[PDB]
Design an enzyme around this catalytic site. Structure first.
Site, short mmCIF file in Angstrom:
data_model
loop_
_atom_site.label_atom_id
_atom_site.label_comp_id
_atom_site.label_asym_id
_atom_site.label_seq_id
_atom_site.Cartn_x
_atom_site.Cartn_y
_atom_site.Cartn_z
N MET A 220 -9.63 1.52 -3.18
CA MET A 220 -8.87 1.75 -1.92
C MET A 220 -8.71 3.20 -1.75
O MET A 220 -7.69 3.76 -2.40
CB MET A 220 -7.73 1.09 -1.64
N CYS B 147 -4.76 4.96 -2.45
CA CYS B 147 -3.68 4.05 -2.84
C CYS B 147 -3.18 3.58 -4.25
O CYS B 147 -4.33 3.24 -4.80
CB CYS B 147 -3.90 2.76 -1.82
N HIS C 60 -4.12 -0.26 -5.38
CA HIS C 60 -5.35 -0.35 -5.00
C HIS C 60 -6.21 0.92 -5.72
O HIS C 60 -7.46 0.55 -5.18
CB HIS C 60 -5.58 -0.74 -3.66
N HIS D 184 0.74 -1.23 0.01
CA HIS D 184 0.07 -0.14 -0.01
C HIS D 184 0.99 1.10 0.05
O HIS D 184 1.97 1.50 0.42
CB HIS D 184 -0.83 0.11 1.31
CU CU Z 1 -3.33 -0.51 -1.12
#
Ligand code: CU
Length: 99
Positions: free
Chosen positions: A92, A84, A87, A37
């Site tokens: 996300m 992120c 993602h 992340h």
């Molecule tokens: Cu992530």
């Protein structure tokens, strides 16, 4: 305030994904699950006068392990959107409001 990167069962989210802090509060994003992340502020969704490069992790830096974290203190009032990179397409994304 603390924000977890990924949910206990590997789900790809910020926990919580919507937070409110006071100007000068520190947000510590902690690497939780579903690595890797990172944390990038959306240039389009930040208060005027906020410098995105100052407040964001470089888009290519990634947190790959437990214990890894990212801290940032926001001072300007208003709403900031963050995401992120890996993602982003998985949803996300999150939002902080500074009061
Ligand atoms: Cu992530």
């Amino acid at each position: 305030a603390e924000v977890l990167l990924g949910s206990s069962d590997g789900g790809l989210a910020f926990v919580p994904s919507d937070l409110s802090i006071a100007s000068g509060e520190k947000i510590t994003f902690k690497n939780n699950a579903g690595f890797p992340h990172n944390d990038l502020f959306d240039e389009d969704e930040v208060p005027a006068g906020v410098d995105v490069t100052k407040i964001s992790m470089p888009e290519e830096d990634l947190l790959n392990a437990p214990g890894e974290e990212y801290s940032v203190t926001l001072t300007e009032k208003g709403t900031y959107k963050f995401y992120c990179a890996p993602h982003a397409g998985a949803g996300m994304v999150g939002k902080v409001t500074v009061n």
